[PDB]
């Protein structure tokens, strides 16, 4: 048992969406987030269902269905684009009514730090390290079954 089903949202193309390509070593794992707006990978650490989403794509009524169950959540944006950032604001808004505000959320793209502390949530950068970025969340995700 012990499977931490996470849910990334706002992934930005094969540049950042590869976030799972980054989190997962498997080079034989196809990546549909490119064409199809979403993807479904799974890795093991110490299980982790990871529904990666870019938000803007037909299966919105489904990505939503992901919310009604996510244990962790990362809101992401691309740096080389002030457009993505703009969405971020909206993103958290979505995560609210639909998903659960009780489950560990997280934002990750010295400026963004601003809107970073404006939501009471951790924060990092488009580093590319990353392997430890899920270590964090997850670590806190476990620092949740303490009650």
């Amino acid at each position: 048992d012990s499977i931490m089903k996470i849910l990334l949202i706002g992934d930005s193309g094969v540049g950042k969406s590869c976030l799972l390509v980054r989190f997962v070593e498997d080079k034989f794992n196809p990546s549909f987030i490119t064409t199809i707006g979403i993807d479904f990978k799974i890795k093991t650490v110490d299980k982790l269902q990871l529904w990666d989403t870019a938000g803007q794509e037909r299966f919105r009524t489904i990505t939503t269905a992901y919310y009604r169950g996510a244990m962790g959540i990362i809101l992401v944006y691309d740096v080389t684009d002030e457009r993505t950032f703009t969405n971020i604001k909206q993103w958290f808004k979505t995560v609210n009514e639909h998903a659960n505000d009780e489950a560990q959320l997280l934002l990750v793209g010295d400026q963004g730090e601003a809107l970073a502390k404006e939501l009471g949530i951790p924060f990092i950068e488009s580093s590319a390290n990353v392997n430890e970025i899920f270590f964090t969340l997850a670590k806190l995700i476990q620092e949740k079954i303490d009650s």
């Binding site: 794992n29 196809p30 549909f32 479904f40 990978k41 489904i62 269905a65 009604r68 169950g69």
Partner: protein
């Protein structure tokens, strides 16, 4: 005959008496006229009103009915909408698992080959050096020969 004569005389006294009373009572109705005219009107209205209400009520009964169905339906809709929103979380997992693997598998079957090629490619290079060496080893003596003897 004095017989009837009296009668007539009497049937003319009583007659006259009536004209008197009637003249009064009929004079009283003339007083109540308007006062009653404006009671009937009310009465007419009151009645008409009594009907529209007798109708609005039938209608209210009718809507309670209709709003009761609609609810016993919005509820079922909202139901399937959810019962079938649960099954989703799963479906898509499989959809994605089989797919992913499916691909992965193929991609490995290429990788395997990919390797063997690199192998032979060099497992070749090797042999090819020995050969471009022996060929020189000979070349060099076949010169020492055509010199000495």
């Amino acid at each position: 005959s004095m017989a009837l004569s009296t009668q007539l005389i009497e049937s003319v006294d009583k007659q006259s008496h009536l004209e008197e009373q009637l003249n009064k009572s009929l004079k009283t109705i003339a007083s109540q006229k308007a006062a009653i005219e404006n009671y009937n009107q009310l009465k007419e209205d009151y009645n008409t009103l009594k009907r529209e209400l007798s109708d609005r009520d039938d209608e209210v009964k009718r809507l309670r009915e209709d709003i009761a169905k609609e609810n016993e339906l919005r509820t079922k809709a909202e139901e399937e909408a959810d019962k079938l929103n649960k099954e989703v979380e799963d479906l898509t997992a499989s959809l994605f698992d089989e797919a992913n693997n499916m691909v992965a598998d193929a991609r490995k079957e290429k990788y395997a080959i990919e390797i063997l090629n690199k192998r032979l490619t060099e497992q070749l290079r090797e042999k090819d050096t020995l050969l471009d060496t022996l060929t020189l080893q000979l070349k060099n003596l076949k010169k020492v020969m055509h010199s000495l003897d």
